[model samples]
Every structure is written in structure tokens, then in C-alpha cells.
Target: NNLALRAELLATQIREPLNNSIGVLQSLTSIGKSAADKEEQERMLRSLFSVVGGVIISGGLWPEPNLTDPSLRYDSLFFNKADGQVDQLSSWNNPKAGGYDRESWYLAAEREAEGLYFWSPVYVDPYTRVEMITVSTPYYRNGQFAGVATVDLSLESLIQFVAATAEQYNLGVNLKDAFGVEVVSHNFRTYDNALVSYYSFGEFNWQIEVVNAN
Candidate 1:
């Protein structure tokens, strides 16, 4: 009974930032589609970091049209909160890919962001040099698909969020990705030996196992 409410609140806490990104980026679509020029659009893209501020490490625009410009075609116009400096997405050096346009999350958004949201699996981000994930929603120009507006969230903060929730609700947790990468907090007992609970990040596909924590 109590576990149900605790789980519900935990889900709410985790979903807040994810849910907020949808609002922020979809709003960007409105702000972006009206921009008079690329510079103005740049301003719209960079503005995302401030509104989504706390959990958001950075945010930016990925333009859809290769015809929009020459030098900027392959890049995403992004801003990193850590430095307050703007950068292009392709330069992030994820190593597995050449540029973000071909990245899975962006490709996913190209299909889903027409009306709603999308997310990425955890990956090491280049800007902050930490493990993080991407959240993006599509922005349109003149009601036509323009591109995605995105933000990065560090996993450190997410792990911290889980810890704080444990303190607030009296539980222990072991989080992991679908690939069995444990997000870590070594209990004397693995805990999965007994009571365990899984809370998922849905599209993110990570799992959280709840324990009583002796």
C-alpha cells in the first residue's frame, strides 16, 4: 500500500525533468518557427538551457534542411551550461558516430517529435565529459518539420536524485541499464536475492530495483 504511493511519487520525481523537456522544446518550436533569420533562430535555440535550467546541461537546435546553409548544415547549434558557450553538435566526439544527424536519438525524433517527445539511452557526453543522456523534441518551421531541439542530462544528477528519494522514502535502490550496467551502490547483500522492484524510465529503458537496505 505505502509502497504504491512511494513508487508513484518516485516516478513523478523522475519524470518531471523528462516531462519538462517536452514542454521546453515544443515551446522552442513556436519561438523558432517565427525567427527571421539564422541568427534569430540561434537565439531561440540557446534560450532552452535557461528555462530547463537545473537538470539541463545544454540545449540546441538540429536543423533539417541541408539547403538552409553551407557551413552549418551538418552541425547542431548548441549551448553548454557549464561554460555558457555555444558549440556545434558534430564536434562532441561521441566516437561511435560522425555527426548527430545520423545519431539514433535524432533519428528517433525525426519520427516521433511531430506531436510529442523522445529520449536517448545513457551515453558519455563530450561537453561535460560525463555520462549523460539526450532528450529531444521536434521543432517545426511553418508547420513543416524543421528539426529537433535537445538537451543533455548528466547521469550523476539522476543517481543523486535516486539517493535523495531513498532518504525521503526509506528504501534502497540499484539502478542499471538494459545491458546490465549497474548504476551502483554496493550493499553488503546484492539485495536482489530477496525483495526487489523495478521502475523504468520507459523510452530510456533503464531499470531501478528497490531494496529495503539493511
Candidate 2:
């Protein structure tokens, strides 16, 4: 009950700010389109970026204490900005020193094509010190895909949450491309080769399996 309560509370704390961030961005994007001059459009975009930056930082801070554990730290969440560039938004604590690509580019592309949210688990490898699992939801403006807002929560952090709960479960999240080839997995070492089966619910996919390295 405590964990659920915490999750609920965290959800409430994070969700509103997230929505506000998205709301403001959407509003600004629309307003920018109507601006008569390039200078005005640029001004609106900058203002929108400022609001988004503030919201993401605030949102990231909300989960800090709970996410500080070394085994349970989340990467910063960022706004896609829809321009092939990423803006650093918020982080679990201070930004993780060095780790995986967080695969932001690929994940962003997938989010755009599918028009839904996407999730992947932590993929730790020897070379890549830390592997980040990502989850992204599409932000729409006027019925068209504008950009993506992603949450890069660490699987270790998620594992910590699951461990504290009463339920016993082992799960993996995966993201595959159009050809159905595995592009991402919870296991970092065995990425594309990891053959765990996943269940799809709308744009999200869930997989559960155990792999023993002997």
C-alpha cells in the first residue's frame, strides 16, 4: 500500500506539470504559426522552450529522492522539440555522468511513426557503462504529431520499485521496428538477439522471460 501510495502521489505530482508543459508547448506552437513575422515566431518558440525547460526540471525534481539510489536512478526526461535536436529537461538527481545513448533518436522516430507511447528497459553493457531505458508519448497539435516527450527512467530504479511491492513479477519491455526485428531490449548485452516474446497493447509492448548466463 505504501509503494502504491507513493507511486500515486508521484504520478499526481509529475503528471500535472507534464501536462502543463505539453499544454503550453502546444499553445505556443499554434500561436507561432499565426505570427506575421519571423521575429515574432522566433520569440514565441523561445518562450515556449523556456516554459518546457522549467516544467521538465520541476517534473524531474519530484522523483529525485526516491530515485537517488544507485541501483534506481533515472535519466533526465527531455522535450524532442521536433527539430532533430534534443533539449535537456530534467533529471533524477544530477545528470548521470556517462551511459547509453538512451537511444533517443531511434525512440523518437518510432514514437512519430506509430503515433503512440513507447517503452524500453535498462540495457547495461560492458562498453556502454550504463544503458538507459526510455519511454515516450506523442504530443499532438491540431491533430498532427508535433513532437515527443520522453521519460528515461532507469530499469534498476524500476526494479527497486518492483522489489518493494508485494507482487512477485519478472518482466522485460521491448521496442521493435516495422519488420518485427528486435531493436531494443531490457538486456543490454544481448540486444537484437534477445528473443523474449512481448505482448502488445496498442503502441506499448510487454515481455517476460529469464535468461541465464552460464
Candidate 3:
């Protein structure tokens, strides 16, 4: 009945915006590594943060000086959305900020293999006081784990889109993380005759399941 094709098409739509997000991390991280002057490098990073879709609140490099250490060196610029200021990744503990040190996006990317898309567990942003998620890419040098370039995305409009995306397609869409924790749920009615199909995106996957609620 083409239900499977509907699922893949839906998955492709979801992946569209994210494709650019992943691109930003890869292209920007290259600049991060090859830039000769640290100060000049930071300037471009800040400029890049200003123009992305508003959902992107913060982002930049989290460098690992060497592979053996558990802690990543925080010597580079991390755009701060809350205070509208640019600060070091180390400043996540700054009086105005909370603990990025313990964040899942930080720790997970630390261990992920190179060339993969990673999304953090849905969590509340301590700064924005809103539900959010982070997306990232781990970068490396000579097969050595170097660091990650990441950005946080707000889920405010995302949940609304779930309602419309489902209703418009006559397909119930449930956004769930790998842990089975639901991210965005539309009240797509459950029918005994209804059917379900699942599609996933990224290395640390998020399942966008399509349901025929009729």
C-alpha cells in the first residue's frame, strides 16, 4: 500500500534541515583546526552563529587536546545564546551558565566514531529553561579522537510541526529517541485497524515512526 514509501519520504523530510546542521559542524570544524590565529578563528565562529536558523541557539568546537584525558580542553569559542555573549566552552560552569561538563551531548560525542550524526537525549536546557536537544559531529586527526563541533536546537516549534505533519499526511508521526523516550508526540489517534512503520536517522538514532491512524 506504499506505506513503507511514505515512511521513507517522511524520514527524508525530517533529515532535510538536519543535513545542513551536520554540514555546518563539518565545515566549521575544518576552520577550527586549520585556522592559524586563534583570535581570528573565534571571530568567524561568532559570525557564523549569528545567521543560522533561530532554533540554533548555541554552538562551536569542543576540542580534545589529547585522547587519553577524560576532560576536553575548552580553549575555543562557544556561542552562548542566553547572555548573547561569546564565551569559551569551559565557561559552561560560569555563574550565568550550568554544567555542560556533565551534558550527554558532550560525553556521548567523546566516544562516538568519526563521521556520524549524534543527537543528545531530549533534556531541559538549564539556561533557556526550555525543552531542547543538541546535535553534533565528532572530528578527528590521524584517526585520533580530537573533539566535537555541536549546537543546541530548541523543540518549541518542533512539537507543533508533529501535529501538522501527521494530520497533513494522514500518518501519525511519533518522534522517539533510541532509549524509547518520546521526543515529540502528536495525538494521532490509535485505531485497532491502524498500522505502524518506523524510519530512523543518524548514528545515535531517533525513530520517527509513521502510523496509519485511520
Candidate 4:
């Protein structure tokens, strides 16, 4: 099969489901109430978190094998899958410098920020040059932002899916901030370079981006 044809097919498949998942997840914001009771708000938050997780895993878009390996593993302050269990991956006990706490992605969103909170992919591992799209929803209870529920998407999964479908028409993917720094890419020369030329996602605080080339 022609590499370009395969890539196009894979992109189509992933993009369709991806868009659906995003739409469903984004709609969760509408559930909030101006005069909701404490119990009602808590129930909604829990439901939203579960829905987000289900969409990510059941959507069949994220690559599972990549989630286990330390090299390819992704983490976030909102969700973490540690403790040798596939249960919700929320946060780690040990705090590392590169962990989700210090990044601008988590810090970018407002406490009251509702609707589908979208974030661009950022690099947690500068050495390996990995990037993933991170989507999260802030769980609100009693008119206060209690915690965050989110999913970290691996760009490599998209790449592998593309490769499996497409033989490789020399596709390249890169992510940058407002300044145009390279976040993640197959091209090493620009890998991890600071993006000082482009605008960043308001939710991500302009941390990183996903750039795909075919």
C-alpha cells in the first residue's frame, strides 16, 4: 500500500474518534450549576472524571503499551496510573522537578474555568523528546474547584498508528510555544528548541505544541 494512503487512512480513523471524544468531554462543562447543592456538585464532578477516563481508554485512540514503559510514560497532576494498577492514574507520591506540578499546563487554567479545558502537548522528558496532548477538566464542588481530572495523550501513539497504516512518506511532527520553540518532533535538529515565534494555547500557558508533517 502507498505510505501516504495508509497515513491518510490512519489519520482519518483516529481523527474521527478523537473529535468525538473531545466533543463529549468538552460538553461536561455545561453540567455545572450556579445554585447546585454540595452533594449534586460532587456527584457531577465524579461522573465527569469517570467519563473522561472512559473516553480516553474506550475510545481506542490512546496506545496502551506506551503508557507502561518509563521511557514512553506520561504523567500529570490531575491523573496518574502508578502503584502497579491500571486504575485511575492521578498523581505520584514522590514529587519530581519534571513532574506535572511545575509545568505551566496545569497552572494555566482558571479555577472557575469551565467547558472542555484543552491543552497543547508538552515535553515532560526533554532528553528523550516526547510530547503528548493533555486534556483535563477541573472538578468543581460547592462552588469551588476541588481537583483536576485529565488525560495525557502521547504523540508517539499517533506516530505509530500512522506508521502502521502508512509506510512512511517522510512524515514529521513538531510542537512549539508562542515563540516557536520545538516541543516534540522526529526532526532532531529542532527537537526541544524554544518556540518563541508562535502563540500558545491559553489553557496550556503556551508551554508546548504538536507539529505533524507528512
Candidate 5:
């Protein structure tokens, strides 16, 4: 009951902010049409950064040279929580010869373009070198797909929370994502010998399995 309750609370906590941020970004679909408005675009991005807390919030705009000027040609804008710095990347050409096209952010944007709410599989963030998961929703303008608004969360931090909770309750626990991939476990051996309890949160159907360590 405790694990389920905690998971429910955490799910609400995480989902609301993401949805709120997406709503904020969706309201700026007109600005996304013309990346020429660099000042307004920057202001919107900064405002979204404040709503999502200390995490990465990114926007990936559709590539359109006619609508975007040189100063705002970059389709990618990343706000880093660690240092309050923002990085812009031009999708027109990879300046570093790196595979920006294969990045999770870009791929997430692609999925979002299909009119889907996307939750990326766990992956390492190239910029921060941290394992992360991205959640994004597509935004549209005048019936055309405009861009994607994304938020990233540290997978390590999520695992740490699961482990800490299990330890505090003196229980064996396994936490898994929607796809049934085990994200973290505490006292695996105990789970084999003790009575197990299971609970799932509705947000992503993330499952929690618990067993008393006694």
C-alpha cells in the first residue's frame, strides 16, 4: 500500500509539470511558425524552463530557411538546468560532423511529428553525460506540425528514489517502466523467498513489486 501510494503521488507530481510545460509551449505555436522572432522565442523557452524545474527543456522546430533568419536558423534550443545555460543547434548542417540526426531529441521530435505523445527509452544524454528519459508532445500551427516541446528527467535519480524507498520500508522492491523493463531493484534475493505485493500507477502503468524483507 505504501509503495503504491508513493508511486501514485510521484506519478502525479511528474506528470502535471510535464503537461503544464507542454501546454505553455503549445500556446506559442504561432511563434514557432517564424523562427525569425528570436527574442520572443527565447522568452518562451526561458518561461518554460521555470515551469519544469531543474531539468532539460528543449524545443525542436521544423526546418524552414524562408521563415527563419540566420541568427535564429537553429531548429534546436536546449535549456540546461545545471547552469541555467541555453544551447542552440542548427539542423541545417552538423557543424561538428557529429550525428545530431541520430540523437534522442531529434528522434523524439520525429515521433512527435506523427501526432504522438512520446516517452523516449532510457538513453545517455550526450551533452550532460547523464542517463535520461525524454517526454515530449507535438505542437501544431494552422493544421501543420510546428515543432516538439520536450522535458528530460535523470534516470539515475528515479532509480535512486526507488531504492531509497524500498530500503526505508525494509522491503525487496522492483520498479519497472511501462514496457516492463526493470529500472531498479532492492533486495532481489528476498523477493524470491518472501510474500510479494504488486501495484501499478496509471500514468504510464509503471509497476512496483514489493516484498517484506522479514
Candidate 6:
């Protein structure tokens, strides 16, 4: 229950800022419309990093129009938290030829964000080439779905923290996403020798398994 509660709290904490960012983008007339407008939008996106602090690695706007004509699509305005550098990318650079739309994370953000929000399963980010997860919310313009606003979390840090905690407590730990596949663990193989405890956060359905040392 404790681990699951922590995950649930974290999810809620992350969602608020993401939802706020999307609302801000939707309220503005500048984003994904034109050059000067895009620069202004980019500025707003960058400001979120300062407000949210260092956990968020990047944030961006993915315009809906980008789906129709790849060439007509305005570059996604992205800000890197590490270097405070902002970049614009015309395509997602996934291995697939279908471009950004082909990636699971983009598709989930586009589809799921419309009703509520979406949390993508952990995947290797094409740009950073790092294992990451994205939390996204949809924005609408004139009552029509306009686009999505997304923030990324690096899994490396998440897993590292879990591993360290498990070691410090001398307990076996297993971290998994909504699916049963293990995302990370420490002394997981020792679970058979100890008493097992399990927890899961419903929003993402991420599970945590803990085993006290026998």
C-alpha cells in the first residue's frame, strides 16, 4: 500500500503541471500557427521547467496539423532541462517511415489525451536515445482537438532510486509497469526466501513488489 500510494501521489503531482501547461498552450493563439507565434509558445513551454523544477527532462507541443502533411507540420517546440537548450524537430525520428505518428508514445498521447490524459509505457526516446516515459494532456482550439502537451521522465533515475532503496532496506524489490514485465528490480531473485508484499497505483497500474529479508 505504501509503494502504491507513493506512485499514485507522484502521478497526481506530475499530472497537475502537465495539465496546466496544456491549458496555457490552448489559451494562447501563438503555438503551432506561425514563426513568431511559435517562438512565443516555445518561451511559455520553457518557463514550465522553472516552475516544475529539475525532474522533468523535456516538454513540448505536438500540433494536430502535423498529422496530415509532414512537411506542413511546424516543428515540435522542445526544451531540454539539462542544458536549458530549446530545439525544434520536424519529425520524431523513429525507425518507422510513417514518422511521428508511427511511434506508440505519440499515438497514445494523441488518442488518449482527448478524453483525459495519457501515460505512455516506458520506451527508448528516439531523440535522447534514453529509456523514458511521457505524460501528456490534450488541448483543443475552438472546440476542436488541437494538439498535445507532453513532459518526459527518465527511467534511469527512477530505476536507480528504487534499486538503491531496496538495497538500503535489505529487501527484494520488483518494479513493473501496467504490464507484468519487470522494469527494474533489486534482489528480486531472493523473493522466494522472504515474505512478499505487493502494491500498485491504479492510474498507471505500476506495480511494486517487496520482499523482506528472511
TM-score of each: 0.75, 0.32, 0.75, 0.42, 0.65, 0.69
Please give the range of 10 consecutive residues that has the lowest summed lDDT in model 1: 88-97
In Å, residue 49's CA in model 2 sits off its true spot by 15
The C-alpha local distance difference test score for the whole of candidate 3 amounts to 0.67
Q: Would you give me the overall lDDT of model 6?
A: 0.58
List lDDT for all candidates, in order: 0.64, 0.37, 0.67, 0.40, 0.56, 0.58
Better of 1 and 3 by lDDT: 3
lDDT leader: 3
TM-score, predicted candidate 2 vs. hidden true structure: 0.32
Off by over 4 Å in 3: 65-73, 80-90, 93-102, 111-113, 141-145, 202-204
Ranking by TM-score: 1, 3, 6, 5, 4, 2
TM-score of 4: 0.42
lDDT per residue as tens, model 2, 1-214: 1333343333333234334544553454354234235445444444444445322321110111223465445433333232424343333224354322234433443326433444444444233233444444444444555334444333343444433221222333333433354443443234656443323423434322222121
Off by over 4 Å in 1: 65-72, 83-98, 111-113, 177-194, 200-206
- Cα lDDT over the full model 4: 0.40
Q: List the residue pairs that clash in candidate 1.
A: none
Stretches of candidate 5 exceeding 4 Å from the true structure: 1-36, 54-74, 83-105, 108-115, 178-180, 191-193, 202-205
* Tens-digit lDDT string for candidate 6 (1-214): 3544444443444334345544544433244433447667767766655455433566577766444454554455655556555454444533234555545555775645454556677787766666776766666666666666677776776666566656655566777776566877777765344446666656565676666533
User: 39-122 in candidate 5: lDDT tens per residue?
Assistant: 677677666555554334444344322233344433455555555555554433343444344555556665355445566777
Count of steric clashes across candidates, in order: 0, 1, 0, 18, 0, 0
Better candidate number, 1 or 2, judged by lDDT: 1
TM-score attained by model 1: 0.75
